[PDB]
Amino acid sequence: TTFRKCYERGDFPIALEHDSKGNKIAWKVEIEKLDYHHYLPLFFDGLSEMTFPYEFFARRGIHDMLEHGGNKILPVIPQLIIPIKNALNLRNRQIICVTLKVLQHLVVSSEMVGEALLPYYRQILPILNIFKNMNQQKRENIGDLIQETLEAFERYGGEDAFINIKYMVPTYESCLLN
Amino acid sequence: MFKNTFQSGFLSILYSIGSKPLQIWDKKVRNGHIKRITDNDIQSLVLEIEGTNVSTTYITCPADPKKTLGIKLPFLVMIIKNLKKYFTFEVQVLDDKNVRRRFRASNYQSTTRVKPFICTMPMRLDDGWNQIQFNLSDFTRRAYGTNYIETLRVQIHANCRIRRVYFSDRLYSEDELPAEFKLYL
Amino acid sequence: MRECISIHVGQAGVQIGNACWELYCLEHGIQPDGQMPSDKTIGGGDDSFNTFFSETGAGKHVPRAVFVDLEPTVVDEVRTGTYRQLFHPEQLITGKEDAANNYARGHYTIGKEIVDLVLDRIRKLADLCTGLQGFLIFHSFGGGTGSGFASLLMERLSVDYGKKSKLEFAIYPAPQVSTAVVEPYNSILTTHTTLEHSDCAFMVDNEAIYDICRRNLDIERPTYTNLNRLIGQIVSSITASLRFDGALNVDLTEFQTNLVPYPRIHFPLATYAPVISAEKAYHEQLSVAEITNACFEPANQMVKCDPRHGKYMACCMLYRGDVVPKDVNAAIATIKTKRTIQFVDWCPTGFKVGINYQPPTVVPGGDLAKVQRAVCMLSNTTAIAEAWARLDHKFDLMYAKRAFVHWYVGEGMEEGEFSEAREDLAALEKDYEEVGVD
Amino acid sequence: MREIVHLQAGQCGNQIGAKFWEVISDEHGIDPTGTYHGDSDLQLERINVYYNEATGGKYVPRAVLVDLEPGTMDSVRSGPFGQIFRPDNFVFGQSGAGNNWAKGHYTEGAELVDSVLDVVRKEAESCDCLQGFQLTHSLGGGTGSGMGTLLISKIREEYPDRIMNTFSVVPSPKVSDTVVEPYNATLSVHQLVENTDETYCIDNEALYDICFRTLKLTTPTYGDLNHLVSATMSGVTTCLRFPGQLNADLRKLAVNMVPFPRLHFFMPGFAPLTSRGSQQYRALTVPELTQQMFDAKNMMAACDPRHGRYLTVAAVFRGRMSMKEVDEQMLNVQNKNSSYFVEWIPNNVKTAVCDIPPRGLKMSATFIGNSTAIQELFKRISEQFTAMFRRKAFLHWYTGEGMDEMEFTEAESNMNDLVSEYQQYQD
Numbered sequence A: 001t002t003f004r005k006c007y008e009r010g011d012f013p014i015a016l017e018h019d020s021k022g023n024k025i026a027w028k029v030e031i032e033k034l035d036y037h038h039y040l041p042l043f044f045d046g047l048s049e050m051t052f053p054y055e056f057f058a059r060r061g062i063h064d065m066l067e068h069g070g071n072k073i074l075p076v077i078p079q080l081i082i083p084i085k086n087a088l089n090l091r092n093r094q095i096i097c098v099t100l101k102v103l104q105h106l107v108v109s110s111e112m113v114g115e116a117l118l119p120y121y122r123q124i125l126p127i128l129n130i131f132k133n134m135n136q137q138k139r140e141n142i143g144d145l146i147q148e149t150l151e152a153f154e155r156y157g158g159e160d161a162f163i164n165i166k167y168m169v170p171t172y173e174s175c176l177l178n
Numbered sequence B: 001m002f003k004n005t006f007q008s009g010f011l012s013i014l015y016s017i018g019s020k021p022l023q024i025w026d027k028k029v030r031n032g033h034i035k036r037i038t039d040n041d042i043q044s045l046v047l048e049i050e051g052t053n054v055s056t057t058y059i060t061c062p063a064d065p066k067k068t069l070g071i072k073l074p075f076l077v078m079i080i081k082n083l084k085k086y087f088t089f090e091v092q093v094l095d096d097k098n099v100r101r102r103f104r105a106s107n108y109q110s111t112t113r114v115k116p117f118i119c120t121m122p123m124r125l126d127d128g129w130n131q132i133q134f135n136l137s138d139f140t141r142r143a144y145g146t147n148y149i150e151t152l153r154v155q156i157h158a159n160c161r162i163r164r165v166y167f168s169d170r171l172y173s174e175d176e177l178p179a180e181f182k183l184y185l
Numbered sequence C: 001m002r003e004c005i006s007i008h009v010g011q012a013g014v015q016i017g018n019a020c021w022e023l024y025c026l027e028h029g030i031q032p033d034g035q036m037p038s039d040k041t042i043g044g045g046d047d048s049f050n051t052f053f054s055e056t057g058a059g060k061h062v063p064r065a066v067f068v069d070l071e072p073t074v075v076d077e078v079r080t081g082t083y084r085q086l087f088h089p090e091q092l093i094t095g096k097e098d099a100a101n102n103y104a105r106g107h108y109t110i111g112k113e114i115v116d117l118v119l120d121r122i123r124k125l126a127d128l129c130t131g132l133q134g135f136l137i138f139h140s141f142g143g144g145t146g147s148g149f150a151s152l153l154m155e156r157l158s159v160d161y162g163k164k165s166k167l168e169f170a171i172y173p174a175p176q177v178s179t180a181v182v183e184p185y186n187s188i189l190t191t192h193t194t195l196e197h198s199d200c201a202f203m204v205d206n207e208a209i210y211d212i213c214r215r216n217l218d219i220e221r222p223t224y225t226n227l228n229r230l231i232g233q234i235v236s237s238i239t240a241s242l243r244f245d246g247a248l249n250v251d252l253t254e255f256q257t258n259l260v261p262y263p264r265i266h267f268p269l270a271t272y273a274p275v276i277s278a279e280k281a282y283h284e285q286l287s288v289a290e291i292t293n294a295c296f297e298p299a300n301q302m303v304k305c306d307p308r309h310g311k312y313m314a315c316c317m318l319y320r321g322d323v324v325p326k327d328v329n330a331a332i333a334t335i336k337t338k339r340t341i342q343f344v345d346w347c348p349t350g351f352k353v354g355i356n357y358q359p360p361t362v363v364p365g366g367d368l369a370k371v372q373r374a375v376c377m378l379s380n381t382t383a384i385a386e387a388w389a390r391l392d393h394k395f396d397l398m399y400a401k402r403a404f405v406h407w408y409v410g411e412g413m414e415e416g417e418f419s420e421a422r423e424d425l426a427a428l429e430k431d432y433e434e435v436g437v438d
Numbered sequence D: 001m002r003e004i005v006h007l008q009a010g011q012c013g014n015q016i017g018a019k020f021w022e023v024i025s026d027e028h029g030i031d032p033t034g035t036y037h038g039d040s041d042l043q044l045e046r047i048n049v050y051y052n053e054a055t056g057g058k059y060v061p062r063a064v065l066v067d068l069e070p071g072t073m074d075s076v077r078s079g080p081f082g083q084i085f086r087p088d089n090f091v092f093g094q095s096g097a098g099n100n101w102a103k104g105h106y107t108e109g110a111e112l113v114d115s116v117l118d119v120v121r122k123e124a125e126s127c128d129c130l131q132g133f134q135l136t137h138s139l140g141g142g143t144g145s146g147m148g149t150l151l152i153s154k155i156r157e158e159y160p161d162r163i164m165n166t167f168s169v170v171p172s173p174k175v176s177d178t179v180v181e182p183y184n185a186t187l188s189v190h191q192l193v194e195n196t197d198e199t200y201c202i203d204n205e206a207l208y209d210i211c212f213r214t215l216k217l218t219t220p221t222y223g224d225l226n227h228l229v230s231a232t233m234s235g236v237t238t239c240l241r242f243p244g245q246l247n248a249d250l251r252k253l254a255v256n257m258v259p260f261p262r263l264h265f266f267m268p269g270f271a272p273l274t275s276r277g278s279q280q281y282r283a284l285t286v287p288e289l290t291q292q293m294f295d296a297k298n299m300m301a302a303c304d305p306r307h308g309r310y311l312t313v314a315a316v317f318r319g320r321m322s323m324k325e326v327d328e329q330m331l332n333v334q335n336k337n338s339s340y341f342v343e344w345i346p347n348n349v350k351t352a353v354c355d356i357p358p359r360g361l362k363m364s365a366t367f368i369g370n371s372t373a374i375q376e377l378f379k380r381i382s383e384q385f386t387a388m389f390r391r392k393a394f395l396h397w398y399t400g401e402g403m404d405e406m407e408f409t410e411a412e413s414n415m416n417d418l419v420s421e422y423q424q425y426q427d
C-alpha cells in the first residue's frame, strides 16, 4: 500500500513509549499547526494497512487528532470516505473491529458530522448492513459493536437518518420512539 | 537511487572538485565536448559542456534509465556561469496521481507551453556566475493543480559552465551555507 | 517485549562488536547466509533472536545495534568481511573525517551533521522494536575518536528520552600505560559530561586481561581476538537473562537500582572467575566454593585496586548452568562470616543473585574451557578512588605547565571546561570518602 | 454453596500456584488434558468449591494469575497444565517491575486495577456464595507486594464480609538479596496488619534445614520445596472438601485462633516426613505423628519458639482414626509442658479429624499455630530499617517516584507498636 511506503520514506515526526505488555505513545511535532488536510487521510490509510508496527501508529493517532482537533474535519470528509470503504472491502475481522471502534469515536468526536455526512451513507452502510449478525473481555463481539455504532449514529444523525439506515438494514430498529 | 539516504539536510548531486564525478550522469557527446578547466574569477576547475547543437549533446541523471531518482525535496539550486549561448534542462517527476510529468526549462523559449505531459519555461538571466532556484510543488500546483511527490530523472543540455547542482527542502538563507556554498569571487 | 538496542561507538568498538555478534550468531547456530537450516526458527521475529536480531518475513536477521565509525578503513574491511550480508549497509554508519583523539573536535566539529543521521537510524529502529528496555553502549574513556561523539549522542538521547536505562561500557585508562598524555584531558571531559546524565557505567582494563591470559589461559602473546572473546563472554553472560530462563530472572533495571546506593557514583566493576585452559579443566574440577573464592581473590579483577585497601558496598553474582541454591547460600554465608571481607555497616545485605539453567556453550576457535557452572560478579567498592587520585595528580602538573593546550585554543575552546571539571572530579573523590566513612 | 477463589500474585505466586494446581489435579485424578477419569465420587461432588465445569466435563481452575514478566507465566503455560489454565485468566503487565515496590504500587497498577477488579468480580458472580479469597505471594516479592497491597485494599471495601487469606512466603533472615527488601517488606506489612485476617509464615532456610535433615536427597528443586508447601496447604484445605467429623470453616478456625485483632501471623507444621531408610524403618501411630508434629525440628515456619511460649495451636489429622488417640495426645503434651504454654488461655489446642486419607499414604496431619516466635523476625526488620534509614540509602529512587519519609516513620511506628503488643501479651 501507499501510506506504508510514504512513512518508510518518512515525513511524520511521531515519538513513542513502550513497556513489557501494554501500550503508550508520544510525538515530536504537534498536529494542529502542521495539518489536518494534507495528512489526515494519508495517515488514515494506515487503518486499511495491517502490519507491525504501523498499526500502532494508525490505531492510536486516529484517535489522537480526533481528541485534539475538533473544528477542522469539516471539509476533509469526502477524502476520509475512501480508506473507510477500502478497509471494509479488505474483509478482516480484527481490522474491521479496530475500524468500528475508531469510527465510533469519529462520530461522537464533534458536531455537524452527521448532517454533513448526509450524502455519505450509501457507501459506508450497506457492507455493514450485511455485516450485521454473522456472530466484554476486550470488546470483541462484532454484532454488539455494530448495534452500538448504529445507536450512537442515528440519534445524532438527524431525522430521516433512521429511515435511510432502515432502508439499508431491514432488521434495523428505532432508538428514538420504541 | 539512494532512497535509503536522508532527504534531510542538503543534496549535492554533482560537485566539480569530485575526482570522477560522472557515474550516474550518462553523457551523450555529439559535435561537442566535456572539459574540466579552471576559471579566472573563482580560479578553480569547473565543468564546460559545449556542442554545435544542444539537442545532440546533453548530460542526464540517473545513468541507468531503468532506475529512478527518489527525492522528496522540492527545492533545487544550480550554480551556473552564463556563457552567452543556448542552454536548457529537463526534470521528470511522479505526482499525486501516479502519472509521470516533465518540466522543460529552455533558455531560448519564446513562449510558455503547457502540454498534458510536460510544462515549458523560458530562461532569461544575467551573465557571469549566477544561480538557479525552483520549487517543484510550486510549479506543479500552479500549472497542473496536482501535488508534487517525488523526482524520477533529470537531464541537462550543453552550453554551460558548471560548479554544482544541489537540492534542498526549503528556501535556505545565505548564512547557513557552507564556505564552498558561500561562493566568492 | 524483552529487548534492547546497542550502540558501538568507535574504531575501538568495531572489533569488539564484530567478535561479539559473531559469537551470538554462533551460539544461535546462525548460518552466514542469513537464514536457517530446515529447522523451524524463522518468522516475524519472536524467538531467542527477537531481542537481538529482527528476522523479517524475508527471513533475514536484523541485529539491533548501530556501529558508528569515523576512520573508514576498518568499517570497509568488515564490509568486505564475512557477515556483511548480515550487516545492513548504512547501519554501519561511517564518517570520512577523523577527530585526532580530540574530545573537542569530536564533540563540536563532526557530530552535529551526523547526530541527526544516527538519530534517524535509532528512531527507525525504535518504531519496529517492541519493548526496548535500554541501550548497550560500547565506547572508551580515552576515545581515539569515540569520546566527544559518544558524549554528544549521550546528551541527545538523555534529553529526548529521560525515561529508559542507559548502560555504558568502556575500556578504562591504563593507570601506568598511556599512548597519549591528553587521554586524561579528554577522559575527564567525558566523565564530567556523563556524570549528570550517565545512568550505569562499567569499565575494563586490558593490562589485567593480559595478566589473566598468562595467568590461567596460557597465552603470553595475546590478541584483540582473545580480548574480545572474553569481554563478549561477559556481555553474553549478562544477556543470557533475556535469552533463556532460569531459577530467577533479574534485570538491568534491578542492577541499576540495587547496585548504586547514592547518585553520581554508578561505576561498579566486573569479575569473571571460571577462566582456565582446556586441559586444566580436563584434569581439574569446578565448583561454587572455589570459583567464589577466586572471584573474591584480589588478583582476579581487571582493575588493579587492592580490596584490602578497599571496602565493599555492592555485589552481584549471576550463575549460569547447573547449580543448586544450598551451596549458593552456604558459600555466601561463609563470605559474610569471613573477616577479610569488609562491607559497609550501611548494608547488612549487599548482593544480588541471579540463576539461569542454560549451560554456557563454547565458541569454536576460542581459548576457554568446557564449563558447567559460570558466574558474573559485579561489585562496587571503595578501592576505586585511588585511580582518580592518580589521574588528578597526573592532570594538575601538566595543566599548570599547560602543555599543548594551543591545539585546543586553536580549535576554539577555552579553559573554563578544565576549570569546572577539576573541582567536579574533586567533588567526586570527596563524595567517595564521605560515603566510605560511617 | 460455599467456595474460595485463588490469586497468584508476583513471580513467586505464579510458580507457587503452578505447583499447587498441578498437585490438586493429581489428587482428584484429572488428566493434564482436562478429561477427568472417574475414581472418587465424593471428590467429584466436592470439587465445585474450587473448579468450574466447562463443556465436556472440564473443570477450570478458579485462580486469577497476575504478574508483569511474560516469561514466568509463559513457562508455566509450557508446563503440563497451562492447557487447563485459561487464556482468559491470564493478565499481563506493561512494565519490568524493577522490583520497585513504589512503582508497582502507584503507577503501573493505576491502569490495571480496573481490569483485574472486573475479572475477579466476574469470577465472584461465577461463584454463588463465597467465604472469601486466598492469595499467594511474597512479602519481599516486589510485584506481589506492590500490587497485592492495592488489590487487597480494594477487595476489603467491596467485600467487607469475606476472609482474605494471605499466603506470603517469608525470606531468609541471613540473606535478603535485594537491599531495599527491608523497606519493601515494612511497606507491605503496614497495610498487611491493617487489612489482613490470616497471614502465613514460611522460610527458605527452614526448608533447606529440613531438606538436609530428613529429605537427605542432596539436591532438591525449589519446586520440591513447593511440593512440600503446597502439600501443606492442600492439607489445610482438605477439611472443606471432605466428610468426616471435623469443622472445616477457616473462620471456625480463625475465631478460635485470634484473641485480639493485632494477631495475624501463623506458623504451619506438617506431619510425617520420611527418608530412604525410614520408609521401612518407621511405623504409623498417633503418638509418633504427634511427637514429630510438635518438634522444633519439624517446625518449618519462622524460627524456634524455644525462646518463647505457645499461645494458640490448631491441627487437623487425616485418615481413619478415632477420638481417644488425639485426646490422650493433647493431654500428654499439655502435661509434659504445662510450663511452655501461657496461663492466660489454658487449653489452647484445637483439632480437626478428616476421614479421607491422602493418596499414597495412610496417616497425615497439618498444624498451624500462634506462638511468640515472630519477635526475632520483626526486631531484625526494625534494626535493619533503622540501620539503613539513619542515612537514607537508595532514597532517591522512591523520591523520584514521589514518596516521603513520613510514610516510613508511621509504618515503622505501627510495626513497633505490634512489637510492644506481642511482647506485652506474653509478658
Ligand SMILES: Nc1nc2c(ncn2[C@@H]2O[C@H](COP(=O)(O)OP(=O)(O)OP(=O)(O)O)[C@@H](O)[C@H]2O)c(=O)[nH]1
Residues within 6 Å of the ligand: C009, C010, C011, C012, C013, C014, C015, C016, C071, C101, C140, C142, C143, C144, C145, C146, C147, C171, C179, C224
Ligand atoms: N576497544 C578497543 N580498544 C583498543 C583497540 N585497540 C587498542 N585499544 C585500546 O583502546 C584505545 C583505542 O581508542 P582510540 O585509539 O581512541 O580509538 P578511536 O578513537 O575510535 O580512533 P582510532 O585512532 O582509529 O583507533 C587505545 O588507546 C588502546 O589502548 C581496539 O581495537 N578496540
Ligand SMILES: Nc1nc2c(ncn2[C@@H]2O[C@H](COP(=O)(O)OP(=O)(O)OP(=O)(O)O)[C@@H](O)[C@H]2O)c(=O)[nH]1
Residues within 6 Å of the ligand: C247, C248, D009, D010, D011, D012, D013, D015, D016, D067, D097, D098, D099, D137, D138, D140, D141, D142, D143, D144, D145, D146, D222, D223, D226
Ligand atoms: N517459585 C520460586 N520462587 C522463588 C525462588 N527463589 C526465590 N523466590 C522468591 O519469590 C519472590 C516473590 O516473587 P514476586 O512476588 O513475583 O516478586 P516481584 O514483585 O516480581 O519482585 P521480585 O521479588 O524482585 O521478584 C521473589 O522475590 C524471590 O525472592 C524459587 O526458586 N522458586
